[PDB]
């Protein structure tokens, strides 16, 4: 499960292993 | 010595700078607007930050946003790239005040060479020839004639309109032209003030690359012929220029180094000249990396983006002018995503299938990928196609093959135009001037013949 | 002067030669076995011909089939490439007898340099050093010792003998032939380009010493171990040997370098897999040069014009498992993303969503990087290796990444015994593999 | 161009703003 | 509004997701 | 009582983290 | 000078230290086992880390785990508190090697005063009285007799007390019984002799020292009221001490502290009978009952530890140490006073702590909190201060009555009974208060209310 | 000796006094209006009585109702607390006639110090300085000038205007007639310094120190501290001695506060509060005395158990009043229901409160929810503890001035000890910080 997240501007590539 | 560098640009150049960072073991941080979220540069980077809304003024030209992004990502230096804030002294001073290193010339040099008037003054001071002209207003027709005697006909009348409102080839024609130019400026430009400059019928655009370090060492890294241009935007660039002689190359290189050292230059810069009838004239200096640095980069075997970073960290030049040696010939064609045959009107859309040409002596500096929607809010340059050869003929053949085998499906490119030019007898002979496109419209007929149907 | 050229090969090399064909304005015809119908070189070529079933003996090695393809497709000359009927005088004789031009050395020269023993004889003439050895069987232990005095210890029985006392026992254990043994040699080879009119040039050296079981993995130009003095002497020797044998086109003379002394081993009669590093450092298209020499052009340059610039390194992207004794790995490549940038060249024979034929070699592609200095080439290669995406099949790319980080490689001390002596490479390789 | 999901997240009293894509 | 406790590799962090 | 947590392994830019969420 | 400190403890003390950190402007990081995830000290701290499972050995006693947590949280110093690892020299050394400051005495001093025997020897140096004894295996009954005359009867036979001998003739039977008992139970069978005090009082002296050798004595404490050997009530000052004896003991404490190279807070515990005081052992940490000394002498000892850890020289001198008022502390432990102080477990339902001037509550529990069983019984400490002892007793009685802790049994009834007992009211509480007055438990029951969870 | 005492008050003081009753072994009886039936002080007390409807006039200021409550519950003495009937001599006389003991000053003393004018006379008769002023109306502008030379400029005209020079008196008299006047000396930047006094029925009196209740908004106190940073040891003795002198002259017999104004090293008497002080808490923590317990004993007839030599200050104490007002909107009254209530805890933290969790605050009477008091060894500690306690005091549902307290305790002027009566007016930056600290 891959999404991209922007914490106050900073781009982060996350990958949740349920 | 800094470890993380922020690239304040987008597209092709941003990827080019980032690759230099990776090879040097440095972290690259990307800045992006909302339109370029799914852009290639963002992903390549080690870290990234939203610089702002799609509007250029609110994103890549927003100084505070870029500096704020650097602070959040921990960047210690900024690479401007080409365009946007790269030649903006305000951005340099803001970056210096924030404690960051500007990977480019110092602010004072940038300012001294910023405006066209200031640069020509600085170039005459350093004994670099400039276009013979009088920047103060010319009151009457008699002064035009006298200025015509000193400058040598033809001359051109312009208004405070960069290109001549009128070109006068004889003293007799000056009364009609002076009258015609005044109305045209009064009615449209709104200022009857004119000035006179020397006119070059068939010039060639030759530029000199200059690299300097923080300690006053400067070197000239060769010439570039950027003659093939539509409007005044370059389309094809090659290195070396066929029109220059070995002696002129040194003479111009020396002039470039004089101006760079005289202004206190640091990092990479490009001095643009006009060349006709064995004579060269200075026009302007770009206080940044050049989009066409690739051809010089391949002919002289130097990574200029890496060189910029090193001198930014304070390294003294690791080579001398004796070490600057050209080998081979390089050509660059701009894949500008605009419609030839339709007055290069911007072409937009989504790129479906992307297959880049490959081989020995082929380089592709791109800012696009397959299944990518090309943002319309900025530039038109999708990628740059560069080839190298043992001689000019080889490089042209590789460019011809690479152009044919470059697959871009969703959007129209000027690739047919490039193919027609590279077949043209004038280009093959190395006689392309600034007036190459205007004087030979057969190019566009051949371009239509090579243009695949795009449909929708 | 011919207009249509047939490439009697597949994969990486086949595409490389075709690119040269297109640039020179020539027609490319491809040959393919039933396995390579969907191969990149058949799609690229202007024309193609089906030469046989997947078995190499029945396809790419079938002389009659290739001549048949040339006739059907209208080809006027054939480029052998490397590894298939290349260095086969019989194929040359068939091609010349069929009315076609063979883009390579002539048959008689190719034959004289074929066998290791035959080449050594041609090499002793023309004054090229060879490994001190006896071609005939060694009768008794005393001859080994006497051969030990002539050659100088260490020697090798065909076991390694370091002293005369160990030769007495070692000879017993083996029961031959004796030759001088080099403890830690380096693989140095010299590039030769020749003309139909007797003009010969030496285009430098290459260090292809990072090798497993006599199979090259990394190649670089120039060699850090060679000095300018050795470079001139070795190149001259290469040209001398070529002229005596009547060479034409591209060739590679392989030497062994130990303790400042070089010894000839073999001459490959054709194009080199690692010719790429030489092309990038000396700025020459060797395949184009071969084509030009084939139509009869005299050499367009002289040894004085041969000038090295920069440093180039090549990593072979082999479909093999480094963690398990380079065991052939096979399968279908899903997504293919090649590294790109200034000074990065990729000579490939695969594409995305391509099932790799198992009947042939393991070479998927060759990754070559060039830099201003060797350090750039190392950094550039390290980035390219990281950014090379081959998702369906196992490759030796992890091994390459570990080697380029290793201190011995960084210093330029990689010998032919590099991999045996440093197994820490495979520990590092495991870390970068998942 | 699916629109993002925007939340305001307070972690140990520090308000961050998040935008999730996909 | 939506308050949880999260232990990232040991470190306790008090989150509040709001909306 | 003591509801058990939800445990997930999250990789952020290549950094493996062990996360436990409560409630 | 550090900015963030990690508290390596739980419950009452951890909150006490955190409050001091907050007041001094420093960040405090908490560590907790799985059982204390919902504990007050984890919520209070600026940051927290999970060090392990509920087992003390795998959590709060895990030296390597605590140090790793400090690195993850950015802590630069560690406050041991009063239990786990506070007097463990190894923990100090691990903290020193990790580059963090230990908010306590140095390792070498901690070691020299670690064992009861080692402390007694360091006390013989520096001229501090100790319990007259041998501490070396006694061979026969005759040696006991001679040692009995030298020390003065009564004396007590102990093993590595088992029996108390009041006369010379009584020594042979007790020695025989004491040996068999040691062999059978402790598998040792070797004994030693000490002087016995029939009705002693437990009086301890608080000492504060700096890295630079300045040491001061911050008064006395009477911790006489104990069950088994565990304190339940502590008060300061002690009614049995005279002003002169108080000074003499403080001087001895500082001398002993300085000789051992002490830094930080510590407590020297004595036994007091018939006008004479005897050193027993020194606690190289903060004391649970430091609260009463804080109320009478108006000093924040936890803040003092932090300052001394940051390198400050003592900001005051012995002349500045002045007692005002009287403070008493009743420890609110979860135990059933009416059934051999058996451990009490459960979940606290409704919690309302007493309030007022001169009332302090240092607690490690809250309302609707399930008390962890794996550790101690101390839920909280109820401390009151007064102008005179009578005032402090009255406030303690009111606070005790108005402390509502529902769901779990506490010894709060016992406390109230004690504070009514005439012996206590006079200040004749000796170590044997509870053992000799079993009427306390009767009163306790009357004040014990019916309870339900 | 009386055994049960009735507390004729509510809220903070009512609970505070009851705690004193419990400690002394005494029974406390509560009185409540219909609004305060479910109030904290009613539950705490041993007994309770309903005195009337929510209007303060018919309940809490109803003498007859309070006397009736004492009769019904059996109380023998009444503690007035602060406010309502605490300073009403009439209530004292009714209480004495019913046979009950008033835990406070005697009626006659209360009267002599009741009015500001009457108090000024008693202070001059006792040699305590007063503000230089004229008690009768000022006839003409010339008298203002002559009074200006006598007192020293600046002076002030009241029924208002502040005149800094003799020349300005001509215009100011004109303006004052537009709005029958009198003149007094004006103090530019004074400090509110008050002295606590404890006395017994037998004429023995002691001075228990000072308190700086100078942070005030519209003459309403917000922060109080002891000791005052502005006083010197000599000034403290002179003022304390003066306070005892005035107390003895009026025949005082209970706890009292003398309020002064302090400017330029000189102190001036203003008013005497013949009751317990709201901020007695800071004095209690610094001098370690239970004043309410002391009141009860002196009322029981005990002779003073200590002497002035025994009165010793230790440490520094600060009190912030948790008033239910909007610090950001001109301290406008805020009412509502308290949801979650958690008081700060720790060493040296005291909360004297009249509210609880899930309590709807009566909209009548005061705005004081509770009083937060901190003690430290030095003032810096006390300031640090107050900052922690203010942050960790949870009062949900109702607006409090706690943000203002937090900003003030961060202000450089307060940190330095320069808090004047004009602290709030001269530094409006407090409210910006207060805005920053609100939800």
């Amino acid at each position: 499960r891959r999404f991209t997240i922007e914490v106050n501007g900073r781009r982060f590539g996350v990958a949740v292993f349920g | 010595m800094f470890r993380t560098i922020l690239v304040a640009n987008r597209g092709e150049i941003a990827l080019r700078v980032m690759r230099a960072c990776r090879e040097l073991g440095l972290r690259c941080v990307a800045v992006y607007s909302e339109a370029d979220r799914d852009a290639p540069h963002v992903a390549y980077a080690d870290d990234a930050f939203l610089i702002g809304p799609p509007s250029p003024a609110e994103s890549y030209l927003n100084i505070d946003a870029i500096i704020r992004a650097a602070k959040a990502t921990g960047a210690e230096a900024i690479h401007p790239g080409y365009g946007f804030l790269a030649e903006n002294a305000s951005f340099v001073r803001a970056v210096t005040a924030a404690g960051l290193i500007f990977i480019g010339p110092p602010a004072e040099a940038m300012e001294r060479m910023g405006g066209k008037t200031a640069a020509r003054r600085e170039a005459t001071a350093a004994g670099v020839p400039v276009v013979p002209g009088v920047l103060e207003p010319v009151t009457d027709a008699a002064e035009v004639r006298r200025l015509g005697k000193e400058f040598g006909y033809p001359i051109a009348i312009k208004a405070v309109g960069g290109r001549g409102l009128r070109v006068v080839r004889s003293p007799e024609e000056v009364d009609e032209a002076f009258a015609a130019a005044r109305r045209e400026a009064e009615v449209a430009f709104k200022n009857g003030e004119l000035y006179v400059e020397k006119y070059l019928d068939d010039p060639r655009h030759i530029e000199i690359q200059v690299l300097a370090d923080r300690y006053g060492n400067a070197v000239a890294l060769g010439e570039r012929d950027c003659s093939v241009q539509r409007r005044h935007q370059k389309l094809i660039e090659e290195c070396p220029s066929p029109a220059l002689t070995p002696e002129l190359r040194a003479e111009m290189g020396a002039a470039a180094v004089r101006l760079a050292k005289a202004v206190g230059y640091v990092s990479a810069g490009t001095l643009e000249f006009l060349f006709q009838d064995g004579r060269y004239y200075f026009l302007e200096m770009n206080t940044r990396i050049q989009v066409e640095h690739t051809v010089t980069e391949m002919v002289y075997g130097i990574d200029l983006v890496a060189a910029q970073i090193r001198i930014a960290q304070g390294e003294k030049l690791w080579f001398k002018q004796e070490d600057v040696v050209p080998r081979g010939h390089a050509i660059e064609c701009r894949i500008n995503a605009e419609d030839p045959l339709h007055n290069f009107r911007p072409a937009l859309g989504t790129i479906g299938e992307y297959h880049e040409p490959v081989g020995f002596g082929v380089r592709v500096d791109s800012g696009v990928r397959a299944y990518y929607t090309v943002p319309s809010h900025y530039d038109s340059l999708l990628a740059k196609l560069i080839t190298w050869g043992s001689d000019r003929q080889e490089a042209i053949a590789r460019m011809r093959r690479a152009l044919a085998e470059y697959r871009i499906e969703g959007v129209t490119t000027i690739i047919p135009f490039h193919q027609a030019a590279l077949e043209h007898p004038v280009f093959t002979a190395g006689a392309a001037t600034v007036n190459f496109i205007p004087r030979h419209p057969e190019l566009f007929s051949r371009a239509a013949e090579l243009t695949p149907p795009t449909a929708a």
Side-chain angles (χ1 to χ4, degrees), chain A, chain B residues 1-115 117-406 408-456:
Chain A
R1 294 162 50 201
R2 272 100 185 246
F3 49 98
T4 289
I5 210 164
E6 266 173 66
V7 189
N8 278 334
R10 209 144 160 232
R11 192 241 203 213
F12 284 121
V14 202
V16 178
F17 298 148
Chain B
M1 196 71 165
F2 49 84
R3 299 155 290 171
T4 56
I5 186 170
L6 189 145
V7 200
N9 220 285
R10 57 172 310 268
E12 171 260 329
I13 197 61
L15 277 178
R16 165 77 178 89
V17 176
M18 286 170 192
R19 295 191 212 107
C21 302
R22 281 272 163 82
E23 295 165 3
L24 300 177
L26 312 171
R27 296 207 310 107
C28 52
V29 180
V31 277
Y32 61 94
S33 78
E34 297 174 9
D36 286 308
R37 268 212 244 259
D38 321 296
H41 74 273
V42 190
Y44 193 91
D46 292 288
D47 244 293
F49 204 94
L50 184 77
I51 201 187
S55 163
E58 233 59 60
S59 56
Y60 302 115
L61 294 152
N62 196 359
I63 301 176
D64 300 1
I66 296 169
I67 298 179
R68 178 161 33 94
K71 292 296 187 174
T73 55
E76 310 160 42
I78 296 190
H79 199 301
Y82 56 74
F84 296 117
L85 304 173
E87 314 197 61
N88 185 213
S90 315
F91 182 55
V92 188
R93 299 176 188 270
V95 157
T96 301
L100 280 44
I101 317 291
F102 186 73
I103 304 204
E108 295 82 33
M110 194 173 290
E111 281 182 347
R112 288 174 62 180
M113 297 298 300
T117 44
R120 68 178 302 168
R121 178 156 29 91
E122 297 267 357
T124 39
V128 189
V130 294
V131 191
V134 178
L135 254 292
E136 285 285 305
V138 181
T139 51
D140 57 284
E143 291 281 55
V144 178
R145 298 190 209 94
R146 289 188 273 262
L147 292 178
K149 273 179 50 144
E150 174 82 17
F151 296 149
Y153 285 94
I155 53 168
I157 317 184
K158 34 192 71 173
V160 298
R163 207 223 79 94
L165 270 55
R166 205 108 164 182
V167 168
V168 295
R169 315 197 93 261
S170 207
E172 297 86 28
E173 317 178 2
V174 309
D175 271 305
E176 172 202 12
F178 191 74
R182 188 161 290 267
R183 170 192 51 183
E184 179 175 356
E186 274 174 342
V187 168
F189 299 93
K190 237 57 187 175
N191 213 353
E193 296 177 354
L194 304 161
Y195 67 100
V196 183
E197 185 173 330
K198 193 189 170 56
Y199 189 76
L200 300 170
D201 308 312
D202 216 11
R204 286 176 68 109
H205 185 279
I206 318 278
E207 53 182 34
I208 308 280
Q209 176 81 56
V210 182
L211 188 77
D213 61 1
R214 313 210 276 103
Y215 314 114
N217 299 295
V219 79
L221 287 148
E223 70 245 49
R224 291 187 286 248
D225 189 38
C226 306
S227 293
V228 191
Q229 53 191 54
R230 165 68 184 217
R231 294 314 188 224
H232 292 305
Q233 346 277 320
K234 303 144 184 200
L235 295 176
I236 310 181
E237 307 108 335
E238 41 185 340
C239 177
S241 166
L244 282 200
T245 73
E247 305 90 30
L248 274 67
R249 295 175 165 100
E251 184 182 339
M252 298 180 64
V257 175
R258 268 182 278 171
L259 192 45
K261 287 187 297 191
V263 193
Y265 205 69
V266 178
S267 283
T270 305
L271 274 88
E272 305 184 354
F273 294 85
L274 269 182
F275 177 88
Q276 184 177 338
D277 288 345
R279 276 213 55 185
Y280 61 103
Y281 315 78
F282 177 72
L283 303 163
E284 234 175 1
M285 180 187 184
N286 295 332
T287 65
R288 50 157 171 81
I289 186 65
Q290 195 83 343
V291 185
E292 44 270 19
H293 76 276
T294 59
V295 289
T296 290
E297 178 154 294
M298 306 203 68
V299 175
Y300 293 86
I302 172 169
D303 189 302
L304 292 145
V305 181
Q308 282 172 323
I309 299 179
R310 292 222 253 160
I311 66 196
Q313 320 213 75
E315 283 209 15
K316 185 164 291 187
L317 282 194
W318 40 98
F319 63 107
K320 300 175 179 298
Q321 188 62 58
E322 38 162 359
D323 298 345
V324 180
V325 186
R327 305 193 72 251
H329 190 105
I331 311 198
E332 172 193 320
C333 290
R334 297 196 188 185
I335 321 296
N336 271 324
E338 40 201 24
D339 214 336
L341 297 130
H342 273 295
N343 283 0
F344 292 83
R345 64 180 182 186
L348 61 81
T350 293
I351 305 178
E353 287 264 301
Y354 198 64
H355 193 66
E356 277 177 6
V358 55
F360 173 51
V362 178
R363 202 226 296 201
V364 196
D365 278 351
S366 166
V368 288
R369 58 153 190 264
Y371 304 112
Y372 180 61
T373 64
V374 173
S376 81
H377 318 272
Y378 315 108
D379 203 12
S380 79
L381 189 97
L382 300 180
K384 282 147 45 174
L385 183 56
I386 300 102
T387 67
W388 180 91
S390 307
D391 51 358
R392 192 167 179 266
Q393 190 177 357
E394 187 164 292
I396 289 177
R398 289 177 181 178
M399 186 62 78
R400 289 187 60 177
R401 177 184 62 85
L403 285 164
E405 299 170 358
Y406 207 157
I408 307 182
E409 295 285 331
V411 192
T412 322
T413 51
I414 51 179
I415 297 185
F417 178 82
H418 287 319
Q419 304 177 244
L422 266 77
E423 300 191 25
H424 202 269
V426 166
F427 188 90
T428 297
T433 53
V434 173
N435 299 319
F436 175 64
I437 302 181
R439 278 154 147 84
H440 305 95
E442 50 263 27
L443 296 171
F444 295 99
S445 87
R446 180 57 174 171
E449 295 173 1
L450 303 175
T451 297
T454 178

